[PDB]
Amino acid sequence: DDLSGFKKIKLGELELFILTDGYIHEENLISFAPRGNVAELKTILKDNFRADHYIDMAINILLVKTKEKLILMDTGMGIFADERTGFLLKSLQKAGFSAHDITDIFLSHAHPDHIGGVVDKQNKLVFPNASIFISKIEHDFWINASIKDFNNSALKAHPERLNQIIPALQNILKAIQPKLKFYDLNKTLYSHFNFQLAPGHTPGLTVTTISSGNEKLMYVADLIHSDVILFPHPDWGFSGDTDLDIATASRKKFLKQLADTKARAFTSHLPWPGLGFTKVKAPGFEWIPESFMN
Ligand X SMILES: CCCCCC(=O)N[C@@H](CCO)C(=O)O
243 is in an annotated binding site: no
Nearest distance in Å: CB 42, ligand X: 18
CA dihedral 117, 58, 215, 291 (to 10 degrees): 150
Give the separation between CA 282 and CA 280, rounded to whole angstroms.
Answer: 6
Query: Is residue 162 a contact point for ligand X (CB under 6 A)?
Result: yes
Interface with Zn ion by CB under 5 A: which range of 79-87, 103-111, 180-188, 281-289? Answer: 103-111
251 binds, among ligand X, Zn ion, none (CB under 5 to 8 A by kind): none
Interaction with Zn ion in 20-39: which residues (CB under 5 A)?
none
Query: Is residue 113 a contact point for ligand X (CB under 6 A)?
Result: yes
Give the separation between CA 126 and CA 100, rounded to whole angstroms.
Answer: 8
Give the separation between CA 68 and CA 76, rounded to whole angstroms.
Answer: 24
53 is in an annotated binding site: no
Q: Which of 165, 207, 229, 246 binds ligand X (CB under 6 A)?
A: 165
Interface with ligand X by CB under 6 A: which range of 108-116, 183-191, 252-260, 277-285? Answer: 108-116
165 binds, among Zn ion, ligand X, none (CB under 5 to 8 A by kind): ligand X
CA 178 vs CA 116, 132, 145, 173: distances in Å: 17, 9, 22, 10
3-state secondary structure of 112: helix
Interaction with ligand X in 203-222: which residues (CB under 6 A)?
222
- Residues 2/203, Cβ–Cβ less than 8 Å: no
Query: Is residue 111 a contact point for Zn ion (CB under 5 A)?
Result: yes
Give the separation between CA 137 and CA 276, rounded to whole angstroms.
Answer: 28
74 is in an annotated binding site: no
- Residues 276/287, Cβ–Cβ less than 8 Å: yes
Cα 135 off chain centre by: 14
Q: Give the H/E segment covering residue 194.
A: strand 193-197
259 binds, among ligand X, Zn ion, none (CB under 5 to 8 A by kind): none
Q: Give the H/E segment covering residue 41.
A: helix 38-47
233 is in an annotated binding site: no
Nearest distance in Å: CB 78, Zn ion: 13
N- to C-terminal Cα separation, the chain: 21
Interaction with Zn ion in 212-231: which residues (CB under 5 A)?
222
162 binds, among Zn ion, ligand X, none (CB under 5 to 8 A by kind): ligand X
Q: Residues 244-273 vs ligand X: string with x where CB under 6 A?
A: -------------------------x----
Nearest distance in Å: CB 22, ligand X: 12
Residues forming the site for Zn ion (CB under 5 A): 111, 113, 222
Would you tell me which residues interact with ligand X (CB under 6 A)?
24, 111-113, 162, 165-166, 222, 225, 240, 269
